[PDB]
Design a protein around this ligand. Structure first.
Ligand code: DWI
Ligand code: GDP
Ligand code: MG
Length: 169
């Protein structure tokens, strides 16, 4: 099958692991160990194509090294996650995109911006604000809830679609 290497990035606590485990296992994990970084695979059919998703759930220590860069560089698309009730995690998005552009050495990298925890009532980041930022980046924006599973498949499948478009260009 066709493999897609996805990398889930974003601040501590935004829901990277919860989103990943929701997609793979269809259940919601609270308080998942923030130090554990793993890759998860799933075979899925997206727009008629059988896909093997290989999803890196980034975690643990913020590390910069030639080795780490090399590893990140193998990522084909990046799910850039913030939490809609945490403004700092949203303003961190610039940094993550900066590092992605740096290691991929391109201003064109498949990316999807994800505003997670959209089930919560105490939003601090407006949907429109994130939409406008995503538009400036030229990437899709989707709000998700790893808790209710709202748009979780949409978020990951949108990233696959972005990678497919990049490959065809
Ligand atoms: C909670 C738990 O420890 C956790 O999940 N994480 C996630 C990974 N990790 C991390 N953080 C940051 O930015 C954190 C920030 C706050 C303190 C200082 N620092 C700078 C900003 F102010 C925000 N950044 C990165 C990071 F860039 C990378 C990484 C390293 C090398 C290259 C690349 C290339 C592309 C990438 F997408 C990433 C990513 C992610 C790269 N890695 C991990 C980071 C905090 C702990
Ligand atoms: N209400 C709500 N809580 C979430 C959601 N996603 C993650 N969480 C909670 O936020 C905390 C951090 O999530 P986690 O997946 O560990 O974040 P990570 O550090 O980015 O991997 C956990 O307690 C989760 O239960 C969500 O969509 N809604
Ligand atoms: Mg985690």
């Amino acid at each position: 099958m066709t493999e897609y290497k996805l990398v889930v990035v974003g601040a501590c606590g935004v829901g990277k692991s919860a989103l990943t485990i929701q997609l793979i296992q269809n259940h919601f994990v609270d308080e998942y160990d923030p130090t554990i970084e793993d890759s998860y695979r799933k075979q899925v059919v997206i727009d008629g194509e059988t896909c093997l998703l290989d999803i890196l759930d980034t975690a643990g220590q913020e590390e910069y090294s030639a080795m780490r860069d090399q590893y990140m560089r193998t990522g084909e698309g990046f799910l850039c996650v913030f939490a809609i009730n945490n403004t700092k995690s949203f303003e961190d998005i610039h940094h993550y995109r900066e590092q992605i552009k740096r290691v991929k050495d391109s201003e064109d990298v498949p990316m999807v911006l994800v505003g997670n925890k959209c089930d919560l009532p105490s939003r601090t980041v407006d949907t429109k604000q994130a939409q406008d930022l995503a538009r400036s980046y030229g990437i899709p924006f989707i709000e998700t809830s790893a808790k209710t599973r709202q748009r979780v498949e949409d978020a990951f499948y949108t990233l696959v679609r972005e990678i497919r478009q990049y490959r065809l260009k």
